Design a protein around this nucleic acid. Structure first.
Lengths: 477, 82, 197, 91, 76, 80, 98, 69, 197, 94
RNA sequence: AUUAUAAACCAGACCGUCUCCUCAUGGUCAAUCAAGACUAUGUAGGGAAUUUUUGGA
C-alpha cells in the first residue's frame, strides 16, 4: 500500500481499497483489512482512512530493519542526461571486486538488457587486466551448466564470473542463472530494472544508474524511489550483521534518495487524475445518481482523507471545511462535464439525475480510460477500415506502461520494412502508439521479435483484449 | 527561365548554322524559337557528311535531335544577361 | 570584442586576440562557479556575458544578428527602433513583421527566422511533497521550429529555480531540448528541500 | 525513398565511375544532384593501363553513368519517414 | 484539320487496315488493325503480321500490343 | 591544367571548357549560360575528330550547345 | 594594408615583425623575406619562437628583458637565446651561419 | 507546351528525311505539340506508293523541307 | 622529395633504433635538423604493427598518434608536413578543433593529432576522453627542453598522466622525446623511462 | 502531397518489381543484364523506384574479342550503383 | 623617460552541419482591362514515358 502513490496504476489500487471500505459500510460487513506496506511518513492518516484504530497501526522507521544496511550514495557530474558514465562504472567495478575478494557476493542494477550487455563486456575488460577474473570455480565446470546457450550473448559474459539477468529470458536459463548465484558459483550478477521482482538475495548491491531512458518523454527519468527500495529491500544472507548498497546517482537526485531511502516514503493520492474513469465506472454501477453521491464516494477514499494535510499538493488554497468541500464539488463538476461532452452520461433537473450511455457503460464494463474511450470515439466511425481500427487501438492511453528504450525508434523503423499494414501520415514516430501499431503486427505476422520487444509485445497484449472488445462494441453501439 | 532559350529567341533573324546527330550541318536564317528548341530556316544550305551538298529553300528541325546550334558573336555580353 | 571592434594599432589587436581565444573560457568558468555557489545576480548576468562571448554581440544587439542568414539592413533597423524584442517574436503575420521591420521586403524571411527562434510557453506548479521537500512539476513547451544548420544537434537550456529576490539559486539543471522534444508538451520535475526560516 | 537520396549524403568520397560508353575515372564526388549530376575535382582518363588523356577537373551529366563504386563500404539509408511524423506536434 | 488525340478515336470507331513501322531493323514491319484508346502512343493491334519488306515474303504472326516508344508509322 | 577546388557550375561560369559528346567529337569553348539540361552556350567552338589514333580540327561557330548528347565538361585554361 | 609607420621602413628595405604587427602585415613581412627581397629584418623574439625562417646572419640586441614575472629587468634567458641563435644559417642553401 | 508554328507549313507537300536513311513525302493535313505529324501521303525512294494517309511518331521525325516554300 | 636519397648525420644512427625496438626514445639534437623526418619515421614504425604490408587497407580505428608541439603556429606548420608525407597511406592528420568536452569526438575518428601541450592536457584530463588515450600508442613530444621554461610543467604533467594514470587499461604508449641539444640528457632519460638505447 | 506518392510504396510489392523487392528482403543471386553484350551476377541489398539499384558480392561476365572469338573476362565488384536504365532483365534464382 | 611571447573552457553519435531544376506558398515589387523577376519556406515533384537527365547499343 505504499505503491498507492506511484503514478496512477497506483490510484487504481487506491481506488479499490476505498471501494472495499465503502462496501464494508454498505454491506455492514465484518471485512478485515491487512494493509502491508513500506514505512510511510503519514501512515497514521492512511490507517484512519482504511477503517482502523491507532492501536492496529504499526508504522515504523526503516532503521528498524534487522540486517542493518549501510547505504552509500554516490553522485557524479554529467550524469543527469545519461543512464551511467565511465567514472560510475569504475566505481561499481571497484565495489564489485571488493565483494568478490571478500566472502560477500554483489549484484549490479541497471536500466535494460542493452545496458547489462554494455556493463558485461566492460566488466570483463576491467577484470582481464586485474588479478580478479575468477569464478571461484574451474572454466570447465561452468560449460556443463550453460550447455543450452540461449541467448548466446549471456554465455561469454557469464563465462568469467559475471552473470546477466534481464526481463524475459528462457525460463530454464533464468532458473539456471539463479541457481548459479544461490549455489555460490557466479560472483557478480547484472540485473535489469524490470527484474527487481526476481529476488536473488545479495550482500553488496550496486545500483548503476538511478536514471532510465524513455521515449515516453524522449528523455532520461529517475528510478522512482519504489524501484530503488527493492535493492535496499534485498539484503545480505551470508554475512550476518551487515548490509551494503552502492548507489550511482545524479547530484540532483542525491537529495531525493539521501532523504527518501533512510526516511519513510511520503504517501499522496493520484486519484485526482483518474477520477474521470473511476467516477464513470461508479455511475455505471449506479450508486452515483447525483452531484452529492460523488462527494460521498470521495469521502470514502484516500484523496479526501489525504488532501486535508498537504492541500497545496492538491491545490486547495481555501483549506477550510467549506473551501475544501467547494473544491471537491468543482472537481466533480469538471469530471462530469467532460463525460457529457464525450458520450458518457446525461443530466437533467427535477435530487438531480445522472445516467450512462453505451460509451460510458462499455468503458465501465471493460475498464478502459475515459481518455482512451474518447480517443476511440472520434477516429472510429462508419466505414472505418481494419488498419484504421488498429491505429485507433494503438493510441489508447493504456500503453503509457510500455518502455521505449534508447535506439528503439530506430529498431521500429527498421522493422517497418517487413510489415503488412502501414501507419498513418499524421501522427508521431517517437510515440508509444507507433510501437504498439508495429508490435501488434509483429505477432500477427509471425516475425522474429527481439527479446526486448517481446516483453513490450506481451505487455501490449495484456491490454488489448478489453480494448478490442470496446472497439467492436463501440462500433456496434 | 533558361537563358539559352532566351538567347535563341533574341537571335530570331540571324544567320544561324547547325549540327545534328548524324552530322548533317546547315547554315541559314532563324525563323522562330520555342521553349523546346524547335527551329525553322530560310535559304538553307545543306552540307552533309556524305559529300553530296545541296541548296534548300526552307527547312524545319526537331529540337530533341540537335547536338548544338551556331550563333554569331553580336549577342555576347548584352543585352540578354542584365 | 563583444561589440566587434577590430583594430588599427595592432598591438591592441594582438592583445585582443588573446582575449578572444580565452574570454569565453574564463567567463564560462566564472558562470559555473556562480552556479555552484548558488548566486543569481551574477550567474544570469554571467550567462549573458558567456553568450556574448560566444556570439560576439551585446545584449542590446538584436538577436537576429546570430542567425547566419538575416540581412544587414534589417538588423540596423531592428536595433535603432527601440522595440522590446519579444514583441517582434510575438508577431504573427509575415506582412505585419515586414511592416514593423522598416522593410516590407524580407518580411516573410524574417518571420521564417522568428519561427526559427527559441521560445517556450513554460509552466510550472510546485507541490510540497512534505514540510521540507518541494516537488516542482515543470511543463516546457518548445514553440520554435528546428533547423540542423541553426539550432545544432541540441538546444541546451540552463533551468534555474531561484528566490523571490533573484539573489540566490535554489536548484538548477541543464536540460537539452532536442529536435524530438520540440512542440511536445514535455514535463520536468525536481525536489527542493528548504531553509528553516 | 529514392536511391539518389543515398548518394546525396556522401559528400567528398573517391570513386572510379564506370560510364555507359566505358571509362575509369578516380575522383572526389563532392555534392550529387537529384538528377545524378556529380562534381569531380581530380581525374584520370580513358578516351575511346588505358591511356591517360591528361584532364583534371570534370563535372558529370547524370545521364552518362553506368556503375559508381568504391567511395565507402557502408549501409545507412532512411530519412523522410522520421521527418513527416515528428512535425505532427499540434493540430 | 486532324488532331492525333481525336485520330485515335476515329481509329477506334472505323476499325481500319494498318502497316506499323519499327526502329532498329528497318526491314521488319508489322501489319494489322489498331484497337485501343490511350494517352501514350502505346496501342493494342489485333491480327499482327511482321513482314520483310523489299529493302532496295510469306511470314505471318499472332496478336500484339506494341510499345508506344517503338512505333514509326500508322496509316488511316 | 590550372583549375582549383571549384565547388559548382555557377562558381565556374566563364571558363574555357573542354566539352564531350556521345559520338566522341571533342570541343573547347568559354562557358556562358548554365541550364537545367546543361545547354551551355560557348563563346567559341573548335570541334575535333578521330576516325574509326590522331585528332583533327574544325572552326565553324560560336554555339548555343544542347545537353542531350553531352557527356561531361572539363576546364582547359581560365581567362584574364 | 601596412598600418603603423613600418611601411616606410619596408619601402626603404630594412623592415620588421613583432607581436603588434597585423596578421596579414606580419605574414607579409615574413613572405617579403621568402619571396627574397627584404635585406634586413629587425624584430623581437617572436620569430625565433614560432616560424622556421632561417637567415645567414642574426644579431640579438640587449641583455635586460623585463619580465612581468619578477617585475624587474633580468638578463637574457639562455633557453630563449639559444632558440634565437638556432635561426643561425640557411640549412638548405648556404654553408654555415653567423 | 509551346505549340510548333506549323500553321505556316499547313497544306503544303513536304520532303522529309526521317530517321535512318528514309526519305518520305506528304502533305501536312494536321500537326501537334508532340510532333506526331498527321500527314496525308506516303511514298518511298525510283519511286513507289505505299499507303495513302500516314500518322508518324514525332520521336522519329527530324528534317522536313517543304517542297512549296 | 628524396633530394639526397640518404639520411642526415643524426638519423643514420637513430634510424635502425627507431625501426628496431619500441622503447621510450628521446633525441636532444640541433634545431631544424630532421626532427620532423624522425617523427615521421617513428609514426611509420608505429603503424607497422596495425597497418598490414599484404592487406594495404590502412588500419584506422586502432592507432591514434599525438604530437605535442609547444606553439600553435608550430603545430599548424607540422600538420601540413604530416599530411604531405602520409597522404599516400591516406592518413587524416588534423590539429584539434577543441570546442566542447562531450563534443570532442571528432578527435576519436582522426588518426593523427598535432596538438599544443596545454590543449593536449585539457584533452587528456577530461573524463569522456579516456577512450582516446588508450587508442594513443604514439605520444611524440617536440621541444621537450621547454621543461626549463614555465610552460613545460604541462609537459611534465602529461608525462605523469601517461605513466601513472592509465592502469585500468595498463598498456603504456611509446614516448619519443624531441629537442635541441641540452645537457642532463641522463636525467631526462630517467624521467621518460629511457635506457642507453 | 504525402498520400499521392507514398501509396506507390505498396505498388513495388504488387507490381512487377515485387519479385526484386522480395529478393532484396531475403538476399539471393540474380542474373543482371545490360546493353552491350553483358552478363552480371550478385545478391540484392537496397531498392528504388526506377531500377537504380545496389547489391553485394558482384561478378561481371563479358567479352573483348578482337577477331571472331569469345574471351569471358571476370572481375569481383562490391557495393555498386547501377543506373536503372541500363538494367533490362533480373530474376530470382533458387 | 617608456617593459619579452604565449596555450588554453563548454553540446557529438540513439541524430539527414549541405544542394541543381520545375510547381505551389505567402511578402514583395516592376507593371495592364487578370499576366512577369526576386528573396524565403521543403509542406510538392523530377521513367510528365516523345523536346533533353533514364535508353538506339
Amino acid at each position: 500500500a505504499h505503491e498507492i502513490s506511484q503514478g496512477v496504476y497506483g490510484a487504481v489500487y487506491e481506488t479499490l481499497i476505498s471501494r472495499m471500505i465503502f462496501i464494508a459500510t454498505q454491506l455492514e460487513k465484518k471485512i478485515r483489512f491487512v494493509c502491508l506496506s513500506n514505512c510511510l511518513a503519514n501512515a497514521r492518516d492512511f490507517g484512519e482512512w482504511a477503517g482502523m484504530t491507532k492501536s492496529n497501526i504499526y508504522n515504523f522507521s526503516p532503521s528498524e530493519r534487522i540486517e542493518p544496511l549501510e547505504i552509500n550514495i554516490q553522485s557524479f557530474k554529467d550524469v543527469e542526461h545519461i543512464s551511467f558514465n565511465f567514472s560510475m562504472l569504475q566505481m561499481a567495478f571497484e565495489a564489485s571486486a571488493a565483494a568478490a575478494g571478500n566472502r560477500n557476493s554483489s549484484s549490479v542494477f541497471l536500466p535494460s538488457r542493452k545496458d547489462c550487455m554494455e556493463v558485461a563486456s566492460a566488466f570483463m575488460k576491467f577484470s582481464k587486466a586485474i588479478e580478479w577474473d575468477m569464478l571461484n570455480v574451474e572454466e570447465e565446470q561452468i560449460v556443463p551448466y550453460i550447455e543450452k546457450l540461449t541467448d548466446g550473448h549471456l554465455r561469454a559474459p557469464l563465462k568469467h564470473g559475471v552473470g546477466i539477468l534481464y526481463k524475459g529470458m528462457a525460463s530454464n536459463d533464468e532458473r539456471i542463472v539463479k541457481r548459479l548465484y544461490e549455489y555460490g558459483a557466479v560472483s557478480v550478477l547484472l540485473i535489469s530494472k524490470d527484474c527487481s521482482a526476481f529476488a536473488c538475495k545479495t550482500d553488496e548491491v550496486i545500483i548503476l544508474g538511478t536514471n532510465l531512458y524513455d521515449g515516453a518523454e524522449h528523455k532520461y527519468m529517475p528510478y522512482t524511489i519504489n524501484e530503488l527500495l527493492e535493492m535496499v529491500g534485498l539484503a545480505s544472507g551470508n554475512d550476518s550483521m551487515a548490509g551494503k548498497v552502492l548507489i550511482l546517482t545524479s547530484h540532483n537526485m542525491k537529495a531525493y534518495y539521501k532523504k527518501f531511502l533512510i526516511e519513510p516514503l511520503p504517501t499522496e493520492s493520484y486519484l485526482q487524475y483518474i477520477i474521470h474513469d473511476t467516477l464513470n465506472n461508479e455511475i455505471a454501477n449506479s450508486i452515483i445518481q447525483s452531484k452529492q453521491d460523488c462527494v460521498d464516494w470521495f469521502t470514502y477514499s484516500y484523496f479526501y482523507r489525504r488532501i486535508h494535510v498537504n492541500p497545496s499538493y492538491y491545490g486547495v488554497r481555501d483549506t477550510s471545511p467549506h473551501g475544501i468541500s467547494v473544491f471537491l464539488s468543482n472537481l466533480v463538476e469538471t469530471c462530469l462535464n467532460d463525460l457529457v461532452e464525450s458520450s458518457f452520461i446525461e443530466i437533467d433537473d427535477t435530487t438531480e439525475i445522472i445516467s450512462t450511455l453505451s460509451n460510458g457503460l462499455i468503458a465501465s464494463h471493460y475498464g478502459v480510460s475515459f481518455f482512451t474511450i474518447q480517443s476511440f470515439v472520434s477516429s472510429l466511425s462508419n466505414t472505418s477500415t481494419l488498419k484504421n481500427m488498429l491505429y485507433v487501438l494503438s493510441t489508447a492511453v493504456e500503453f503509457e506502461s510500455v518502455p521505449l528504450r534508447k535506439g528503439d525508434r530506430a529498431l521500429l523503423v527498421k522493422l517497418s520494412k517487413r510489415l503488412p499494414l502501414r501507419f498513418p501520415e499524421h501522427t508521431s514516430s517517437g510515440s508509444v502508439s507507433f510501437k504498439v501499431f508495429l508490435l501488434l503486427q509483429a505477432y500477427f505476422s509471425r516475425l522474429e521479435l527481439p527479446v526486448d520487444f517481446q516483453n513490450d509485445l506481451k505487455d501490449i497484449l495484456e491490454k488489448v483484449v478489453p480494448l478490442i472488445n470496446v472497439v467492436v462494441d463501440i462500433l456496434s453501439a | 527561365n533558361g537563358i539559352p532559350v532566351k538567347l535563341l529567341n533574341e537571335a530570331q533573324g540571324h544567320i544561324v548554322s547547325l549540327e545534328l546527330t548524324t552530322g548533317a550541318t546547315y547554315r541559314g536564317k532563324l525563323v522562330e524559337s520555342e521553349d523546346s528548341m524547335n527551329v525553322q530556316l530560310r535559304d538553307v544550305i545543306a552540307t552533309e557528311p556524305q559529300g553530296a551538298v545541296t541548296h534548300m529553300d526552307q527547312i524545319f528541325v526537331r529540337g530533341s535531335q540537335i547536338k548544338f546550334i551556331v550563333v554569331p558573336d553580336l549577342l555576347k555580353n548584352a543585352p540578354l544577361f542584365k | 570584442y563583444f561589440s566587434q571592434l577590430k583594430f588599427e594599432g595592432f598591438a591592441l589587436n594582438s592583445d585582443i586576440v588573446f582575449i578572444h581565444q580565452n574570454a569565453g573560457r574564463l567567463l564560462r568558468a566564472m558562470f559555473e562557479i556562480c552556479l555552484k555557489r548558488g548566486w543569481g545576480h551574477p550567474t544570469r548576468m554571467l550567462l549573458n556575458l558567456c553568450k556574448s562571448a560566444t556570439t560576439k554581440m551585446w545584449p542590446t544587439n538584436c538577436p537576429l544578428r546570430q542567425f547566419k542568414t538575416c540581412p544587414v539592413e534589417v538588423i540596423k533597423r531592428l536595433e535603432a527602433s527601440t522595440v522590446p524584442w519579444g514583441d517582434y517574436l510575438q508577431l504573427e503575420t509575415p506582412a505585419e513583421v515586414g511592416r514593423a521591420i522598416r522593410s516590407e521586403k524580407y518580411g516573410k524571411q524574417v518571420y521564417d527566422l522568428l519561427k526559427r527562434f527559441p521560445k517556450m510557453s513554460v509552466t510550472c506548479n510546485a507541490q510540497p511533497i512534505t514540510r521540507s521537500v518541494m516537488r516542482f512539476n515543470i511543463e516546457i513547451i518548445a514553440d520554435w521550429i528546428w533547423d540542423m544548420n541553426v539550432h545544432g544537434s541540441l538546444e541546451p537550456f540552463l533551468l534555474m529555480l531561484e528566490d523571490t529576490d533573484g539573489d540566490s539559486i535554489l536548484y538548477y539543471d541543464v536540460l537539452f531540448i532536442t529536435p524530438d522534444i520540440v512542440g511536445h508538451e514535455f514535463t520536468l520535475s525536481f525536489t527542493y528541500e528548504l531553509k528553516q526560516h | 525513398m529514392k536511391l539518389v537520396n543515398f548518394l546525396k549524403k556522401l559528400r567528398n568520397e573517391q570513386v572510379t565511375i564506370e560510364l555507359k560508353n566505358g571509362t575509369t575515372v578516380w575522383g572526389t564526388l563532392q555534392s550529387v544532384s537529384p538528377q545524378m549530376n556529380a562534381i569531380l575535382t581530380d581525374v584520370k582518363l580513358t578516351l575511346p593501363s588505358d591511356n591517360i588523356a591528361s584532364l583534371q577537373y570534370i563535372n558529370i551529366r547524370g545521364n552518362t553513368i553506368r556503375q559508381i563504386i568504391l567511395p565507402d563500404s557502408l549501409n545507412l539509408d532512411s530519412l523522410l519517414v522520421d521527418q513527416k511524423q515528428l512535425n505532427s506536434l499540434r493540430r | 484539320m486532324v488532331p492525333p488525340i481525336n485520330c485515335i478515336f476515329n481509329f477506334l470507331q472505323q476499325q481500319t487496315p494498318v502497316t506499323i513501322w519499327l526502329f532498329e531493323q528497318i526491314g521488319i514491319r508489322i501489319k494489322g488493325k489498331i484497337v485501343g484508346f490511350d494517352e501514350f502512343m502505346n496501342v493494342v493491334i489485333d491480327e499482327a503480321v511482321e513482314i520483310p519488306v523489299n529493302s532496295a515474303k510469306g511470314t505471318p504472326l499472332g496478336k500484339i500490343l506494341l510499345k508506344g516508344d517503338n512505333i514509326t508509322l500508322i496509316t488511316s | 591544367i590550372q583549375v582549383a577546388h571549384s565547388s559548382r557550375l555557377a562558381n565556374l561560369i566563364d571558363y574555357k571548357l573542354r566539352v564531350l559528346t556521345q559520338d566522341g567529337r571533342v570541343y573547347i569553348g568559354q562557358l556562358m549560360a548554365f541550364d537545367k539540361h546543361m545547354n551551355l552556350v560557348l563563346n567559341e567552338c573548335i570541334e575535333e575528330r578521330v576516325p574509326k589514333i590522331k585528332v583533327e580540327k574544325r572552326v565553324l561557330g560560336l554555339t548555343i550547345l544542347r545537353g542531350e548528347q553531352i557527356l561531361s565538361t572539363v576546364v582547359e585554361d581560365k581567362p584574364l | 594594408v601596412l598600418d603603423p609607420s613600418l611601411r616606410k621602413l619596408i619601402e626603404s628595405g630594412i623592415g620588421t615583425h613583432h607581436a603588434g604587427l597585423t596578421r596579414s602585415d606580419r605574414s607579409l613581412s615574413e613572405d617579403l623575406f621568402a619571396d627574397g627581397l627584404l635585406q634586413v629584418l629587425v624584430c623581437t623574439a617572436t620569430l625565433a619562437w614560432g616560424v622556421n625562417l632561417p637567415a645567414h646572419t642574426v644579431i640579438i640586441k640587449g641583455t635586460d628583458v623585463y619580465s612581468p614575472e619578477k617585475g624587474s629587468w633580468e638578463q637574457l634567458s639562455p633557453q630563449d637565446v639559444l632558440q634565437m641563435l638556432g635561426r643561425a644559417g640557411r640549412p638548405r642553401y648556404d654553408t654555415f651561419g653567423e | 507546351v509551346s505549340t510548333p508554328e506549323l500553321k505556316k507549313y499547313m497544306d503544303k507537300k513536304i520532303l522529309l528525311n526521317i530517321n535512318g536513311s528514309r526519305k518520305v513525302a506528304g502533305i501536312l493535313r494536321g500537326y501537334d505539340i508532340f510532333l506526331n505529324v498527321v500527314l496525308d501521303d506516303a511514298m518511298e525512294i525510283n519511286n513507289h506508293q505505299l499507303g495513302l494517309q500516314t500518322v508518324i511518331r514525332g520521336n522519329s521525325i527530324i528534317s522536313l523541307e517543304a517542297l512549296d516554300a | 622529395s628524396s633530394e639526397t636519397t640518404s639520411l642526415n648525420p643524426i638519423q643514420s644512427k637513430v634510424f635502425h633504433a627507431a625501426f628496431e625496438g619500441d622503447s621510450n626514445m628521446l633525441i636532444c639534437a640541433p634545431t631544424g635538423s630532421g626532427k620532423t623526418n624522425i617523427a615521421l619515421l617513428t609514426v611509420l614504425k608505429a603503424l607497422s604493427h596495425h597497418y598490414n604490408p599484404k592487406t594495404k587497407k590502412l588500419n584506422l580505428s586502432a592507432f591514434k598518434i599525438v604530437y605535442i608541439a609547444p606553439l600553435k603556429a608550430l603545430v599548424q606548420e607540422q600538420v601540413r608536413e604530416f599530411q604531405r608525407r602520409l597522404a599516400f597511406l591516406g592518413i587524416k592528420v588534423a590539429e584539434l578543433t577543441g570546442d566542447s568536452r562531450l563534443s570532442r569526438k571528432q578527435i576519436d575518428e582522426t588518426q593523427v593529432l598535432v596538438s599544443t601541450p596545454e590543449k593536449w592536457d585539457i584533452t587528456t584530463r577530461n573524463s569522456n576522453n579516456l577512450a582516446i588515450v588508450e587508442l594513443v600508442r604514439l605520444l611524440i613530444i617536440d621541444e621537450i627542453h621547454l621543461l626549463h621554461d614555465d610552460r613545460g610543467p604541462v609537459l611534465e604533467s602529461i608525462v605523469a598522466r601517461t605513466f601513472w594514470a592509465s592502469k585500468y587499461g595498463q598498456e603504456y604508449p611509446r614516448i619519443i622525446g624531441l629537442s635541441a641539444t641540452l645537457p642532463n640528457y641522463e636525467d631526462v632519460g630517467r624521467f621518460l623511462r629511457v635506457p642507453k638505447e | 502531397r504525402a498520400e499521392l506518392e507514398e501509396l506507390e510504396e505498396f505498388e513495388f510489392k504488387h507490381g512487377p518489381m515485387s519479385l526484386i523487392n522480395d529478393a532484396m528482403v531475403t538476399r539471393t543471386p540474380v542474373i543482371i543484364s545490360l546493353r552491350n553484350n553483358h552478363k552480371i551476377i550478385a545478391r540484392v541489398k537496397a531498392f528504388d523506384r526506377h531500377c537504380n539499384m545496389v547489391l553485394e558480392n558482384v561478378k561481371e561476365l563479358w567479352t573483348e574479342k578482337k577477331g571472331k572469338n569469345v574471351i569471358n573476362r571476370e572481375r569481383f565488384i562490391s557495393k555498386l550503383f547501377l543506373r536503372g536504365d541500363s538494367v533490362i532483365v533480373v530474376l530470382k534464382t533458387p
